[PDB]
């Protein structure tokens, strides 16, 4: 139905710029205002501006002034958010939502875009298998895992078995250490599954385009 | 012998109230709410008031006395003073046509939506009309409704597709053909204008007795109105909430000297004519001074009664009534004011006298501005003029009338912005100007003083005299400069004006500039001796 | 400009109880709130809009009251999945701004945490590093000690500890202990023993393995 289908993340040296996307589907793009809010990290949202797609009509906001420009295209049904002069507070998550002229509510917004800001090396991601070892006492239940370390920025996925199944997984947050990041997954499944059947973890880290597959051995 | 002097006033209290309903109009409604609200709020008080003292006040008294004193003409009167400045009195006479050319469709306007205002059920309550758009939503209709960036008001639907027929334009290239019922409306103004001028002080005098004390009444009738609407003290927060940071701006100050003398109006000659037929022993400083006070505090007291409806219209909707008061120009009363009075009670009522009051407010000041041009022809070409004063009111009016055809069209709107805005405003200030400087340099403000002080019986203080010499010129001189360096990129109903459209507009800012450096041209080219000599004696008055 | 103030950051509440979180504004706003849920990891979801009104898909156990400056987020069945952080908003005024967000936190019983160790893998041994990893599954509340006994004693330098957030389905925090080691100094012990004190129990849980080919 309505989807809003932004940009992925972005790793940007401070000083420089940075470009985000949204195409916009599932309704009449032309009839709706077009706006970008940002997310800092452990702190609220915020309303950067507008802008109408008829004629690119740009609401900004007074705190985003010449920080944010909005722009748009009918062609491709697209709105792009540029910015310029890229601080550590520029280090935020990003939504492009849908919104009516009144009532001026939020209804449909985007999946974000997760933008980093800092001059540090794109690391790739350390994948280190965490399997139980031969002298636990196997019980209704084995708990599984998969150990990431030493990586830049935040952007990571680990997924198990193509998301089937995942009824039963503990991700555990990236910490931050000496400027790279170190990150675990686990997994609770029946012993009646293992090791018989197959069961890898998948490490994919997108700035740097990375995507390392690794095995559960005993 | 046989004429002679000129006729006089037939009270004190009619032509008082004559001038008081030419300086009170439309935009003393609308305009001034506005512009106070969106500079300071409240604070736009203070200096709005100082370019009162300052700038408006001595201007006006300076104009009134002169009219009283010399009792000529807006052209005859500068051939007793400075000749070479003669035609000053005929720059005004095309200002006055290009104001009338787009002044009286607006009361047009108001006066289609008076006779489309006395069936039972208002038009732009409903949708279900010939002219409105599937985009037409309205009230008494589905809730939850969400409006769409496409989406139209049946009040703006109204203004929009009918009344104007804006949308049978593409803009200023292509705006005709013409509105008939805008011309049958206009036709009717330039009729009930013609019937109340065409005699001369007389009647005016009398018509202004109506034209100028019901708006005083609707305006009351709107305000206990507005004052007993539910959640109105939105507006009036949003209308006096002080903003003294605002003050720091140095454009207020120009918003509110712009303000304060395009709804005085001074050295236009009008208030020159009406002066003109007036007693020599009757005082008129007392006059000015309560005549001003009237113009601002009827502007001061229309703000509450715009802005508690918008109030009120904001509570039904929700809030921030800067939002419903985005739009400044017509559409804030013919669209969002009339949809908020299509909301109340008895809404047949308060929208006839609503738009009744309109008309009342332009019928005065119409009167006036032809008046001033007329006395001045009469004057300056009398026996030459007067076997009838019907016959040159008819053609000055018929006049406007082929002058308006261009602003009854279809884009018509577009055309009374761009004469409103680029026209008119920089030419009078400019007119004003050379006016105010060649009164009290070139005449003398000393022997101005002395006329004065012969007319009242004691010399102006020095505070009107500092005013005339140094503060009035400069306040003038300000809202030149300020408007020349910054012209306005215009725009209206989700249209922006084309690059060259202030090109034309200069032109039509020139075009009544022209007459007086021509005319000077005239006179030091047909004055013989030499360039002192001759400018010598033209700066000197007549001697007779 | 308008503020909109959540005074309270974090709203504890249990699974079938009544909720409502409160927002203040800086002046009058009329009935011009919105409420919006954003899951952990999701996109903000607009729930009310105009103070009482729902929108389209948002389920009736949701709704919204107040009128002036004070309004009301109520919540009449919790369920596990409703965790999530919620704001208010106004939507009159530019700019639009946000409260500050409160966190709805689910309260429920005891639960003792499932406690895993983890030897060093041998691709890990491969690059020269040993990591000891210690699980800490299906455990409430939050407040939970970890302790590391390398051989006995208690180890403290090189433990990290990540805590998640509260589940979805069962509302249970999940914890990882992390003992990140050099090969040389792995390669000088055997038994490796992680425990963990909870208000669960007086008696920590403790887990231990032994390096030699487990
Ligand atoms: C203030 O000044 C006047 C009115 O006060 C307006 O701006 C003014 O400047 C231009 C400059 O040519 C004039 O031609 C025009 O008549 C007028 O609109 C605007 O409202 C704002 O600039
Ligand atoms: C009253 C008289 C003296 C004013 C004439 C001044 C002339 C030069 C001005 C007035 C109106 C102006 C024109 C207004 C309309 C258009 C159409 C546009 O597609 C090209 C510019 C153009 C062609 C302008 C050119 C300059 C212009 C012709
Ligand atoms: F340029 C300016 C001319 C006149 C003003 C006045 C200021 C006070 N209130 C009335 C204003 C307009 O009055 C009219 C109405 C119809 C007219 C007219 C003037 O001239 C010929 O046709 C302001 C500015
Ligand atoms: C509604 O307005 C849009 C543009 O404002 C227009 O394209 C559309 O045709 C209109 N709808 C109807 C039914 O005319
Ligand atoms: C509420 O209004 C929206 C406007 O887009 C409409 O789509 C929706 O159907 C309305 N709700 C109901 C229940 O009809
Ligand atoms: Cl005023
Ligand atoms: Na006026």
């Known amino acids: 139905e309505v989807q809003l289908q932004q940009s992925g993340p972005e790793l940007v040296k401070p000083g420089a710029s940075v470009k985000i996307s949204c195409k916009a589907s599932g309704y009449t793009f032309t009839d709706?205002?077009?706006?970008?809010?940002?997310?800092?990290?452990?702190?609220?949202?915020?309303?950067?501006?507008?802008?109408?797609?008829?004629n690119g009509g740009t609401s900004y906001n007074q705190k985003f002034k010449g920080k944010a420009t909005l722009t748009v295209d009918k062609s491709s049904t697209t709105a792009y958010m540029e910015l310029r002069s890229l601080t550590?507070?520029?280090?935020?998550?990003?939504?492009?939502?849908?919104?009516?002229?009144?009532?001026?509510?939020?209804?449909?917004?985007?999946?974000?875009?997760?933008?980093?800001?800092?001059?540090?090396?794109?690391?790739?991601?350390?994948?280190?298998?965490?399997?139980?070892?031969?002298?636990?006492?196997?019980?209704?239940?084995?708990?599984?895992?998969?150990?990431?370390?030493?990586?830049?920025?935040?952007?990571?996925?680990?997924?198990?078995?193509?998301?089937?199944?995942?009824?039963?997984?503990?991700?555990?947050?990236?910490?931050?250490?000496?400027?790279?990041?170190?990150?675990?997954?686990?997994?609770?499944?029946?012993?009646?599954?293992?090791?018989?059947?197959?069961?890898?973890?998948?490490?994919?880290?997108?700035?740097?385009?990375t995507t390392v597959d690794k095995k559960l051995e005993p | 012998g046989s004429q002679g002097e000129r006729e006089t006033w037939g009270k004190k209290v009619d032509f008082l109230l004559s001038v008081i309903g030419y300086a009170?109009?439309?935009?003393?409604?609308?305009?001034?709410?506005?512009?106070?609200?969106?500079?300071?709020?409240?604070?736009?008080?203070?200096?709005?008031?100082?370019?009162?003292?300052?700038?408006?006040?001595?201007?006006?008294?300076?104009?009134?006395?002169?009219?009283?004193?010399?009792?000529?003409?807006?052209?005859?009167?500068?051939?007793?003073?400075?000749?070479?400045?003669?035609?000053?009195?005929?720059?005004?006479?095309?200002?006055?046509?290009?104001?009338?050319?787009?002044?009286?469709?607006?009361?047009?306007?108001?006066?289609?939506?008076?006779?489309?205002?006395?069936?039972?059920?208002?038009?732009?309550?409903?949708?279900?009309?010939?002219?409105?758009?599937?985009?037409?939503?309205?009230?008494?209709?589905?809730?939850?409704?969400?409006?769409?960036?496409?989406?139209?008001?049946?009040?703006?639907?109204?203004?929009?597709?009918?009344?104007?027929?804006?949308?049978?334009?593409?803009?200023?290239?292509?705006?005709?053909?013409?509105?008939?019922?805008?011309?049958?409306?206009?036709?009717?103004?330039?009729?009930?204008?013609?019937?109340?001028?065409?005699?001369?002080?007389?009647?005016?005098?009398?018509?202004?007795?109506?034209?100028?004390?019901?708006?005083?009444?609707?305006?009351?009738?709107?305000?206990?109105?507005?004052?007993?609407?539910?959640?109105?003290?939105?507006?009036?927060?949003?209308?006096?909430?002080?903003?003294?940071?605002?003050?720091?701006?140095?454009?207020?100050?120009?918003?509110?000297?712009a303000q304060i003398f395009?709804?005085?109006?001074?050295?236009?000659?009008?208030?020159?004519?009406?002066?003109?037929?007036?007693?020599?022993?009757?005082?008129?400083?007392?006059?000015?001074?309560?005549?001003?006070?009237?113009?601002?505090?009827?502007?001061?007291?229309?703000?509450?009664?715009?802005?508690?409806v918008l109030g009120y219209?904001?509570?039904?909707?929700?809030?921030?009534?800067?939002?419903?008061?985005?739009?400044?120009?017509?559409?804030?009363?013919?669209?969002?004011?009339?949809?908020?009075?299509?909301?109340?009670?008895?809404?047949?009522?308060?929208?006839?006298?609503?738009?009744?009051?309109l008309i009342t407010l332009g019928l005065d000041s119409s009167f006036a501005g032809l008046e001033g041009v007329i006395t001045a022809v009469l004057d300056e070409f009398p026996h030459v003029w007067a076997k009838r004063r019907e016959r040159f009111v008819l053609a000055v009016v018929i006049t406007c009338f082929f002058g308006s055809l261009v602003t009854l069209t279809f884009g018509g709107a577009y055309v009374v912005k761009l004469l409103e805005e680029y026209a008119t405003g920089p030419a009078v200030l400019t007119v004003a100007?050379?006016?105010?400087?060649?009164?009290?340099?070139?005449?003398?403000?000393?022997?101005?003083?002395?006329?004065?002080?012969?007319?009242?019986?004691?010399?102006?203080?020095?505070?009107?005299?500092?005013?005339?010499?140094?503060?009035?010129?400069?306040?003038?001189?300000?809202?030149?400069?300020?408007?020349?360096?910054?012209?306005?990129?215009?725009?209206?109903?989700?249209?922006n004006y084309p690059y060259w459209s202030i090109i034309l507009g200069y032109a039509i800012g020139t075009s009544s500039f022209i007459c007086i450096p021509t005319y000077i041209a005239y006179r030091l080219i047909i004055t013989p001796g030499t360039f002192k000599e001759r400018i010598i004696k033209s700066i000197t008055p007549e001697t007779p | 400009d308008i503020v909109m103030t959540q005074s309270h950051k974090f709203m504890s509440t249990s699974v079938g109880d009544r909720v409502s979180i409160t927002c203040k504004a800086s002046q009058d706003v009329s009935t011009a709130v919105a409420w919006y849920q954003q899951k952990p990891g999701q996109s903000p979801k607009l729930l009310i809009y105009s103070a009482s009104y729902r929108y389209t898909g948002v389920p009736d156990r949701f709704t919204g009251s107040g009128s002036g400056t004070d309004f009301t987020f109520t919540i009449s069945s919790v369920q596990a999945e409703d965790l999530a952080v919620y704001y208010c908003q106004q939507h009159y005024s530019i700019p639009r701004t946000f409260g500050g967000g409160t966190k709805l936190e689910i309260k429920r019983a005891d639960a003792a945490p499932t406690v895993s160790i983890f030897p060093p893998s041998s691709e890990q041994l491969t690059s020269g590093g040993a990591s000891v990893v210690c699980f800490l599954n299906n455990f409430y509340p939050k407040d939970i000690n970890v302790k590391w006994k390398i051989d006995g004693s208690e180890r403290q330098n090189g433990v990290l500890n990540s805590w998640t957030d509260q589940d979805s389905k069962d509302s249970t925090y999940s914890m990882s202990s992390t003992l990140t080691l050099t090969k040389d100094e792995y390669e000088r012990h055997n038994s490796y023993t992680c425990e963990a004190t909870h208000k669960t129990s007086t008696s920590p849980i403790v887990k231990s393995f032994n390096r030699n080919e487990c």
């Open chain 2, 433 to 495: 100007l050379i006016e105010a400087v060649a009164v009290s340099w070139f005449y003398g403000i000393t022997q101005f003083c002395r006329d004065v002080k012969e007319m009242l019986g004691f010399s102006p203080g020095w505070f009107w005299r500092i005013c005339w010499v140094a503060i009035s010129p400069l306040f003038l001189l300000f809202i030149i400069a300020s408007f020349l360096m910054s012209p306005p990129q215009l725009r209206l109903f989700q249209y």
């Open chain 2, 313 to 357: 219209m904001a509570e039904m909707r929700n809030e921030d009534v800067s939002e419903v008061a985005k739009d400044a120009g017509p559409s804030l009363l013919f669209i969002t004011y009339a949809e908020a009075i299509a909301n109340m009670p008895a809404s047949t009522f308060f929208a006839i006298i609503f738009f009744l009051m």
């Open chain 1, 32 to 54: 709706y205002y077009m706006n970008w809010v940002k997310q800092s990290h452990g702190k609220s949202l915020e309303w950067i501006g507008n802008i109408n797609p008829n």
């Open chain 1, 88 to 209: 550590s507070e520029d280090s935020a998550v990003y939504y492009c939502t849908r919104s009516p002229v009144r009532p001026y509510y939020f209804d449909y917004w985007g999946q974000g875009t997760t933008l980093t800001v800092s001059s540090a090396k794109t690391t790739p991601p350390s994948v280190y298998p965490l399997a139980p070892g031969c002298g636990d006492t196997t019980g209704s239940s084995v708990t599984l895992g998969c150990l990431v370390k030493g990586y830049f920025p935040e952007s990571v996925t680990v997924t198990w078995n193509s998301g089937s199944l995942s009824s039963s997984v503990h991700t555990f947050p990236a910490l931050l250490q000496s400027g790279l990041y170190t990150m675990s997954s686990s997994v609770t499944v029946p012993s009646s599954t293992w090791p018989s059947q197959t069961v890898t973890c998948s490490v994919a880290h997108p700035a740097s385009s």
């Open chain 2, 24 to 257: 009170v109009d439309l935009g003393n409604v609308w305009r001034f709410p506005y512009i106070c609200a969106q500079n300071g709020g409240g604070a736009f008080l203070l200096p709005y008031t100082i370019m009162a003292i300052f700038g408006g006040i001595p201007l006006f008294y300076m104009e009134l006395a002169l009219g009283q004193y010399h009792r000529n003409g807006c052209i005859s009167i500068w051939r007793k003073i400075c000749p070479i400045f003669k035609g000053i009195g005929y720059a005004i006479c095309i200002i006055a046509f290009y104001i009338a050319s787009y002044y009286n469709t607006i009361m047009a306007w108001a006066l289609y939506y008076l006779i489309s205002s006395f069936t039972d059920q208002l038009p732009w309550t409903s949708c279900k009309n010939s002219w409105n758009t599937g985009n037409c939503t309205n009230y008494f209709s589905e809730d939850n409704i969400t409006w769409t960036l496409h989406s139209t008001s049946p009040a703006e639907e109204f203004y929009t597709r009918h009344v104007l027929q804006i949308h049978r334009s593409k803009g200023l290239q292509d705006l005709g053909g013409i509105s008939w019922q805008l011309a049958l409306c206009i036709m009717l103004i330039f009729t009930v204008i013609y019937f109340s001028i065409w005699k001369g002080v007389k009647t005016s005098g009398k018509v202004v007795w109506v034209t100028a004390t019901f708006p005083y009444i609707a305006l009351s009738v709107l305000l206990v109105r507005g004052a007993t609407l539910p959640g109105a003290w939105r507006g009036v927060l949003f209308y006096l909430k002080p903003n003294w940071q605002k003050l720091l701006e140095t454009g207020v100050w120009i918003d509110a000297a």
């Open chain 2, 262 to 308: 395009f709804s005085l109006g001074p050295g236009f000659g009008v208030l020159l004519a009406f002066a003109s037929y007036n007693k020599f022993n009757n005082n008129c400083y007392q006059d000015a001074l309560v005549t001003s006070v009237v113009n601002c505090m009827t502007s001061f007291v229309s703000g509450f009664v715009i802005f508690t």
